[PDB]
Amino acid sequence: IQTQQLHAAMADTFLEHMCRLDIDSAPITARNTGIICTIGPASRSVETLKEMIKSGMNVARMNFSHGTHEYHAETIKNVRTATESFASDPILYRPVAVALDTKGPEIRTGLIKGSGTAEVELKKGATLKITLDNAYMEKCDENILWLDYKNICKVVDVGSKVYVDDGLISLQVKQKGPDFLVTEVENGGFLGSKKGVNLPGAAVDLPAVSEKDIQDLKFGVEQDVDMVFASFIRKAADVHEVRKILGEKGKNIKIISKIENHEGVRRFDEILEASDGIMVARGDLGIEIPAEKVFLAQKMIIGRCNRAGKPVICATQMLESMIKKPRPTRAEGSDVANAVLDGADCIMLSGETAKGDYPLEAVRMQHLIAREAEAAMFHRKLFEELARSSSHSTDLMEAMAMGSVEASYKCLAAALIVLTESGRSAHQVARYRPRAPIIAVTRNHQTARQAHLYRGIFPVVCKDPVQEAWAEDVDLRVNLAMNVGKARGFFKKGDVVIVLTGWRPGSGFTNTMRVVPVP
Amino acid sequence: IQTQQLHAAMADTFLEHMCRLDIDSAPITARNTGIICTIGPASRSVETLKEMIKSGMNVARMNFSHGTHEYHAETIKNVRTATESFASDPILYRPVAVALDTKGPEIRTGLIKGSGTAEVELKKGATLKITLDNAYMEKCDENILWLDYKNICKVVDVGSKVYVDDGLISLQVKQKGPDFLVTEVENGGFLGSKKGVNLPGAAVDLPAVSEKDIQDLKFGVEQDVDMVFASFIRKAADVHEVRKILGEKGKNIKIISKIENHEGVRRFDEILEASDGIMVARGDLGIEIPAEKVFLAQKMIIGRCNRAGKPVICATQMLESMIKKPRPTRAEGSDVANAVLDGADCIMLSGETAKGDYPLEAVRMQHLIAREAEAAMFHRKLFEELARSSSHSTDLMEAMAMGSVEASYKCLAAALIVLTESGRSAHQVARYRPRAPIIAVTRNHQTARQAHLYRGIFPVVCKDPVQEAWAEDVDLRVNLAMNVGKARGFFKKGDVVIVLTGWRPGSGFTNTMRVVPVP
Amino acid sequence: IQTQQLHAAMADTFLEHMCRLDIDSAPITARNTGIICTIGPASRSVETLKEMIKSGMNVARMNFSHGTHEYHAETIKNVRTATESFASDPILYRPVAVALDTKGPEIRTGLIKGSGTAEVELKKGATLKITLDNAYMEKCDENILWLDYKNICKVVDVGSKVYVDDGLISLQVKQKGPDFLVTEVENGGFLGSKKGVNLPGAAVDLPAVSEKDIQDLKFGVEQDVDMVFASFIRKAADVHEVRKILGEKGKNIKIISKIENHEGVRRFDEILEASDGIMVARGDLGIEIPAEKVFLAQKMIIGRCNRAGKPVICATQMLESMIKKPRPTRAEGSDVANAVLDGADCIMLSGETAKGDYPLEAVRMQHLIAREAEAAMFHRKLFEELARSSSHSTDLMEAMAMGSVEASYKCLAAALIVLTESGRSAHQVARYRPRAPIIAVTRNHQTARQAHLYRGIFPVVCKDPVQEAWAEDVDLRVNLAMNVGKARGFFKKGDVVIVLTGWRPGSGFTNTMRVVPVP
């Protein structure tokens, strides 16, 4: 019984590959898919945070949707505190990234009967008037609803829908003024105060970044975050707006755009081009667009990112059930696996880690699945497809990247060691999706942290100073990776590995590839 | 307008590939397909030879079915003399392989009027008597044909047909003696000395290894030949014998089994596995089996050799017309093209160089077709298919070769540079069919002549003394390849090349790959 | 029991397909590729015609570059005579197309000694004068050489080369005057009558449609030819022009455009678009462009027509040898085979039948090889690729064809029977390249003759009155095919067949497909 689906690995057709999948074919230890964990009341603590890390957490996400700078900073603190707890063991030391997830633009209704706690019941078939007249900003009721968005009438059409409270309530626009909308309740319910609004299919003119947003971003810069997950990206311009706020001081910050609505879906190509990476924000996306179309968008985005060699995250509700249970639903298991199969670089956990009763279990779970799924990919066919996709380019690093993955397959290397500073060299390899882990040694901590964004990349920080011999310094670095993979269980002495390096110190890329034996 | 059929190279389907072939898309200057010339009267002179090498000859074939050991050693003499005429400028110096073509279990004709260059014109409807009277051994003419097969009497029966010169002449047995036969000419033609006789279906019993064969064999050793073309090889057993004869002294000689009979097609696989290479010998084959079937054999044979990764030569009648004519026929043009496209490591000239009036041109012509066909190959598909085929192998040098070819494809490398001594590394690379030229640098003159056997290797002798410093020595050899490609106009400064070298002296194989710019 | 390369028909890769071609795997009786024979001095006789038909000939080409209207008219005559000689038993009657091969924008020498069957030897180094002096027109010879082109002196410089007979003979201009040219003979050979002059790379302003062209055109319309081989078509405008002269009376004559120069190639697409079909005229082409490039043209061209769904012919020097020999060269056998694998709908014979010694053998040999090659095609991949191409298209008859072919493969049907009058349903099928024979039953003679143009169509002329009842009438015709297929040995009882018919009369196509057993 082969391991790591190597039997299906050898199939000719996709169908044959499936037919060959084997529950009894064990996968390797090394889990390539990055796991992003939302931190919160359930996971903030150091002790916990140490467990999260032990469980497989690669990225700590900060949901700026709630909490104060003072809170989040305290969260980052603990994260950083937890991470360093292992630093004492440069070998067993694992980098953890920090991400800032913007609150983003928002539309909110007013107060019900001047109260924050009151409610009304909207009844299916009724009429309901939306006004912009702040006169009513605290006089909402069964007949009148005031909202935040001054420009609404401009972006919505008669016959369109307005969703209130996470799509809990649905309204149909029957009349439009310059100041109000006249709707008809389709999907009734109780209405509380200050609920969220969604305008499915609307091209919203709300700014790329809120005022709050500008503030959190500057904050994220001062905090030295590794990426930013930018909410509500609808077009390239919005990415550029974010880029601009982060500015020169934060030009190294990775900006991940969140696709959460039709627009974003429809203008995805430009957004992708402008971004550093993408997050498929299923939550809103599934509110914005028909829940039954989310999967298409999900696969569209994943594929296109794969094709461009830009990182992509699958997020939201992956293991939802696990907020209350130790074991997920079957669909949950399915989802994570397909996501991985689709090509997702990272997968995410929100409620599950943030507030749920089984944060660690959710992590471990994601870990378990990803590994299985990772073996189950159809690499030969995938590599082939990707290669065609990129055929337009004759880049050298890419050539180095393709040649090295191809050899890792050929001799079934146990790993690929890439020495990089910027991470570019490692990134090129990841994109060609080897099956073996990519252990990338760098002296740049940030590069190391950010590496997680990418599938298969396992960052290893070199904390030693530079030797007078390049060659020697290189050799060393290489050895380091070697002690790691060994310490990790990726391989053993005698195993074969693909080693990528720069020929000289001004190389510019890993232009030197080698097949080597583990000591 | 792209060069080197690169548009076509981009194709998704074979059909599309074909469709984009462009007469205006120009080939590169490096001809990858080895050219095998049969040296005889027309080409024996040292002066012709020189012109021969210049024009493209990589290997000299000495047909032991013709001339004497005396005639052949002189040939070999002018051969090495002409080659060696170019050893001053190590840059433009070219190795030229010497090959001995075996007699084997064949039936041969005597001497037309005591000239091994003599000929006579037979007529349709005429009578001819075949005798065994040695008193006619050197006395063949329009009226008496002496054979060398004693039993060919009990082997044929009246009404039968006897074929002379690869079916050139068909004789019908009309009267039987005990010492001879009287036949009638079924079709006219000329008639030489020492032509082969085929009795398709007949039951001749000829040892796999003539006394002569050993004679010839041991002479070849005496002459330091590089390889052996073993005529009418029928089984693997036949192969081990020759090997046995060659013995220790020639353990480095390469045995190229010649498939020229139904048995050899039939036992193809075991022969293959025993041989060092194969030769599709169509002259004989073409009479032995149905003409209309030769292409099957050919394709089949080419396919399994490539699949197997061993050199295959496609031989005989390729440019036939040109024995008398300056320019070939369209079918000959097609023939050569297709053979290259089928996958031949080399193509051959027989009557074309050994005794036609347009030998120089013939070689020339092969060169032209070869370049053009090499470009029209479907590298991308071929590589995928080859990879598939070798999938059970996990060989270290194969990984290296595959990564190399792959990179080379990606960046459109100008050449591949391999530093080898056995020349195995090189061999391995060529098996994956790179589009670029492989410059094979070696301090071993045999390995060097031998490399011609394989598609795309441009062997280059390194005559320099061995450097104390492994890296310096390496660089040494590298530059020499750098210089040749430059000389031969293979690339320029700022052109990119893949370099295969060994990490440490006595590295085993070329375990190091680099992308490098041409100096 | 191995048959029709069915094992190879199951390979996954092109490589494995090749690897599995078996000489011992016998082909079926039906020869799919049509055989075109140039009818000349050596094949004019009725008695010779009868054997050629018998021999596999489907079309006769009458070369207008040679002879007179009268000589050709008689040939037609004889053609039709040897044909209907078989009309006795409609089961065994085989239609024969009559093809008009045009003169075109060509330069042509004169009569060698008022003959035309006459030849002349030219020796190397000798002198020859080219003249425009009509008083030599029919008096050519070793000394004097008259030509078609009064401007030739303006179009060629001293030192230049003049090619006679498709490059057979190279003449270098030594000196020129107003009237004549003074050349020296560069290579020896037989110079015959009304030969071809190729002034490669020289501005000849010849007209697309000569008045003579015109003349001949009109002549063949009266001669009721089925098709036209338009020589030297350079651009679509040429076609329209031919089309133009064909006018109304011949709005049904198939115009087959011959690509025999650099322009024709270059403007191939629009040509193809305008023409009914294409010939690869390698004789002229091969001298018009570098010899080494013809296979590129041929492959690009055959591929493109396949794609298009239009019939393509591979022509010239396929079995050249056989003008004098009974057995072809290796190179020639590979060429016909390779032509068939390339995808040519038809193959041709020129000198081989027109004037050679072995007309019958050449034919048979084409028959022989084709069959073998038809088998060897990789039908599976080919069909997929063909589909990939045709994908934009949603034609109804195309779907029928495809489904039908698809079904034919699956159940290994013995044949497809198509009932058609226009012939289009049958072409549509032929274009999707089933392995099995298309028995095209029709009541249109012309249709039945022209069917030879298309790969795999076996035309059957139904001679019986129309049935009042469609069903019976259809049945009958089906019956016809059955009998014929049975008498030709295509299938036996209990064999399976695919049946293509129309539901109702005047169905515009065969919209009904059925799987049937032979009775």
Ligand SMILES: Nc1ncnc2c1ncn2[C@@H]1O[C@H](COP(=O)(O)OP(=O)(O)OP(=O)(O)O)[C@@H](O)[C@H]1O
């Ligand atoms: N050394 C030579 N001496 C004289 N004639 C030679 C020589 N080598 C080749 N020839 C001539 O060229 C012809 C073709 O050469 P080739 O090597 O193909 O020989 P072959 O008879 O056709 O035998 P084989 O089947 O082994 O190739 C020979 O038949 C012979 O007439």
Ligand SMILES: Nc1ncnc2c1ncn2[C@@H]1O[C@H](COP(=O)(O)OP(=O)(O)OP(=O)(O)O)[C@@H](O)[C@H]1O
């Ligand atoms: N009608 C004919 N009368 C006599 N000889 C003929 C005739 N047709 C063909 N031949 C001979 O056969 C040779 C080859 O025939 P073919 O039809 O191929 O002519 P061709 O000269 O090569 O010109 P093309 O390029 O049109 O094919 C001709 O050159 C001619 O000598």
Ligand SMILES: O=C([O-])C(=O)[O-]
């Ligand atoms: O913001 C998100 O993550 C979402 O909406 O899913």
Ligand SMILES: O=C([O-])C(=O)[O-]
């Ligand atoms: O022996 C050969 O080379 C042949 O028969 O073609």
Ligand SMILES: O=C([O-])C(=O)[O-]
């Ligand atoms: O006309 C032809 O066939 C040619 O020129 O090849």
Ligand SMILES: [K+]
């Ligand atoms: K958020």
Ligand SMILES: [K+]
């Ligand atoms: K021999």
Ligand SMILES: [K+]
């Ligand atoms: K013509």
Ligand SMILES: [Mg+2]
């Ligand atoms: Mg959201």
Ligand SMILES: [Mg+2]
């Ligand atoms: Mg020979």
Ligand SMILES: [Mg+2]
């Ligand atoms: Mg032979």
Ligand SMILES: [Mg+2]
């Ligand atoms: Mg022509």
Ligand SMILES: [Mg+2]
């Ligand atoms: Mg011709």
